[PDB]
Amino acid sequence: MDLRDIDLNLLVVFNQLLLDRSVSTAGEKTQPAVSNSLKRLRTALNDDLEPTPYALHLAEPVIYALNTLQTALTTRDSFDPFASTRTFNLAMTDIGEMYFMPPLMEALAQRAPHIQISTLRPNAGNLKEDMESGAVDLALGLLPELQTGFFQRRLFRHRYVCMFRKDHPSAKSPMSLKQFSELEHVGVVALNTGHGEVDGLLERAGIKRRMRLVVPHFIAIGPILHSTDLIATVPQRFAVRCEVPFGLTTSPHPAKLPDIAINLFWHAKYNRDPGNMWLRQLFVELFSEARH
Amino acid sequence: DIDLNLLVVFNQLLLDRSVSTAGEKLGLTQPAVSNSLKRLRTALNDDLEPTPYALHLAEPVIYALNTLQTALTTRDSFDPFASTRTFNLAMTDIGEMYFMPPLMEALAQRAPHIQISTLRPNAGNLKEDMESGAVDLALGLLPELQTGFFQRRLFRHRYVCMFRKDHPSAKSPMSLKQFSELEHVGVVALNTGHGEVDGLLERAGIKRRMRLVVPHFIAIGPILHSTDLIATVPQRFAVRCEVPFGLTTSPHPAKLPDIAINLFWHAKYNRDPGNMWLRQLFVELFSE
Amino acid sequence: MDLRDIDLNLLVVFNQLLLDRSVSTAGEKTQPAVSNSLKRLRTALNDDLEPTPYALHLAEPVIYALNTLQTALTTRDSFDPFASTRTFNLAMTDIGEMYFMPPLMEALAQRAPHIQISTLRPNAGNLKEDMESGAVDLALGLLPELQTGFFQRRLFRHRYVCMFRKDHPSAKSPMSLKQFSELEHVGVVALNTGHGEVDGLLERAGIKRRMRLVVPHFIAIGPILHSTDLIATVPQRFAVRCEVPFGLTTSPHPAKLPDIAINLFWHAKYNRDPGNMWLRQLFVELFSEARH
Amino acid sequence: DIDLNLLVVFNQLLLDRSVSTAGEKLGLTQPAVSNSLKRLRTALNDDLEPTPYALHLAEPVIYALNTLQTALTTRDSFDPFASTRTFNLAMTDIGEMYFMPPLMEALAQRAPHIQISTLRPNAGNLKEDMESGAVDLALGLLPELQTGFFQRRLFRHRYVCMFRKDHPSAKSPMSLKQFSELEHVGVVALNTGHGEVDGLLERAGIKRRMRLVVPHFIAIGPILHSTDLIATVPQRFAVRCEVPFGLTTSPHPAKLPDIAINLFWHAKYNRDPGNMWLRQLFVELFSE
């Protein structure tokens, strides 16, 4: 079929036939080189192109089809954030979501209005294989399982802090270890995260706590602290998200706890993928505290 | 006038109709349980894991041994002022966010020394752990729990549209046309009642520009606060979010079904003072 | 536990303790036989039963529990349709459903108000195994695959007829073969049913048909015939269901077609199951044309 | 100015990137297709089933070869008065019942010699058979069809409650209380849009005495006619049922989402005169 339509370079001259005439110039754009090829376009196609109906039926659909090969001039190395309609999938924890997503979406509103963002927890499917396959573009957090086929970039470190409602009858900042051990706590187990070791670190330090409430995740901590005299041990970025909205106060933690490293992860296979690079750089711009 | 002790043997000739056999649990030797089985087949005129009409009789007699055992066994006393007991409650993140703050506020004045621990509904498995007492109460939409579970509807979730106050476009009440013009945050919420919403809107032919999709509800407040995105959320989540994050709601322009949030407890703990006390507290605080 | 509660025949005497006193008579219902056993009921249970609180806590829950063993007096051979809350599962075709279900539900409204009926097509799961397991109580139709472990009872035979709208411009009853072959048809493939052989029987008889429309099932036939000049070859029971509602006329079929046998099927395992027997007999009563 | 014939080869170096290889379909020998592949890798400076940035270029060039081939290939003429062509349409039983009578009535006056054949949506598979032309049009709620399928919403199903006219209790409009008092017929309708209804009512906490459950809609009319049962049905089924079976409807007291019924056709037949004619007929008859 198309092998019988043969040379389509003659369809590039049919672009000069999609433009009307300009023929000696369209040759010079030569006229004898055109003449045989267009005559051959006609030996291939009965119509004398002198504009003919079916010639108009060929003129425009040729252009778009020819143009997409020229629209292809933008290489794979090209990526236009302001026009992209691509979806990016990002792995992060609930805290990661709560912290990263609002300023990201805020920035994306201007820089990439037409893209879509989807998030997931680092345990939805299998993170490694999904990132290698391109199902997940980036991951955020500690993630010690991401090693061989993965690059990583440090975004920031944040400590655990103690949080409680601002008009607490007795809680003070900076909080003493004594008061910490006398007040009542709401704790997050946070299974399979970096935050699970906290209870062990405290107990192995001889720091007893009256655990009035234990929840598996962070969603309710803000409202709980707001309406009770409980206090909580939480990551500082979470505390940052919660302080003003729930009328909460934080304090440097009276206990010795390690800080948490939050890194940006991507697979080696996409180290040079333009869209991935762009989003990566946006994350670095918004959240990296290197030059602080 | 046929002896009843053999009937006592029957219920474990049912649980261990699996013929492992029961006698080891009974404390009686298998020959004695076989003599007992002879007394059974004789008194019933039926040879009973081959199960006959004894299957038909098993449930009337299971209904018999149940009430007799409960009325005989003494139950654990419960003093709310003094109790140091830990209650384990199964609920969703929405459920946690809505229930826990007013509950804990209430527990501070009614039962100062008890401990509460919450968990996600699936998968303990929940029915098993509620049978064993590992989980005391369950909350929300849980279809699996019918046989052996008492239930009670606390309330009905109604869906609304949530956005920030000073949103340049969004109005209340919002049109269905404006709803499809604006940009949305999606909450997957897999395997919960709220995980159906996107599907419902899809099947209704409601076109929706999905700018952001998250699996859960934790970031919705902050996200709406800092963007012009709109969300489809349960009303009570919205009431938990409005003031802290500076958001308003509109009645949802699309026809969405309400979702009944119920309270569940296993039949084995229907008479347990502590369980009764806590679940009555849930009814007092949250039922409409 | 209950082995320590020992003799519960003493709970049957505790039924005479659930009734209040009547003691010499409750003995005669003897008094010394009672006396040691009730004294022993007391050596087992501290309370002096003289009505005591916990004695009242024992009185009623004992009765219901004792009564269910006496409520058990109704044997497996017993089945009360007027009080049953049992669900019956019935396998049948769409035509079978359309024909059987309305007079059945009509009859059930008085005879078994509290039972539930569910239906399914003879190809939902695997019919044989589901009927042997009790997942399906009865099946209705031809069903030649139901042989070894199954009993069957003939309900009726019905022929194929020709159906068309009552004010058809030309269609007549009784219809001639000529007119049948000249008019236009809507046909039902009815895959994996007894009705699929029809087209083959007609074609192998040299009867050409102008098939204007072919549908896989019967749901639309009535409305289609009502609004068109098409005619259809359909089972007569279907025609019975459709004639008046859709303003249709039927005619004895001009072509030689075999009639269809509709039988009632149940598994041997449930030949004597009282509820099954009852429903079976209700089907025989409502639909059997033996003594016609 | 790089030659285009190699680009023609590329699209089958894509379909047969599976490297079976394409050349057998091409009619060219594999050595010539390998020389062609050398011209490819040379002109593109990229070594392309290992697929590189040529994957990025494959779709712009698939977008290229598509329009060029369609505009070149002559299409089949269609004369509705004379056409003897058979159209295969995929739809549900509800869809069949609603669409077929007014369609056939219309076809009797517009295209007397064509033949129509309907089938159930799953599983041809539908997308495959619509690609091959075995199935011409699809109708209803079909989520699978997005890539390579043009679609258009005909209308929206709204759920109502149906019962017989002289029903001793049922009123219009029906209360939600009366809805839970009366007895119901259930339609499973597995894997259709309407198979969700029971689940929606369940999750809303709408108690429903389910006296009868059937898998499909064929018997609902006759059943309602001869009993005091009520049903939850799409409005158009109800309008097909009211007069023949002596039934009325009430607005559904429960909040149920509408269900968009769309019309689907494969992109490969978007320019086909007959397909265009029939689907335009569907739009003329049924779109609201």
Numbering used by the authors:
A (entry chain A), C (entry chain A): 1 to 29, 33 to 52, 61 to 303
B (entry chain B), D (entry chain B): 5 to 52, 61 to 300
Any passages from the paper?
of transcription factors found in prokaryotes. N-terminal winged Helix Turn Helix (wHTH) DNA Binding Domain (DBD). two Rossmann fold-like sub domains (RD1, RD2). conformational changes which modify LTTR DNA binding sites promoter region DNA.
apo-DntR homotetramers adopt a compact homotetrameric configuration. well-defined electron density for the wHTH regions. apo-DntR they cannot bind salicylate and DntR cannot be activated. constraints in the crystal - packed closer to the tetrameric core. solution is different to that observed in the crystal. apo-DntR reported here result in very poor matches.
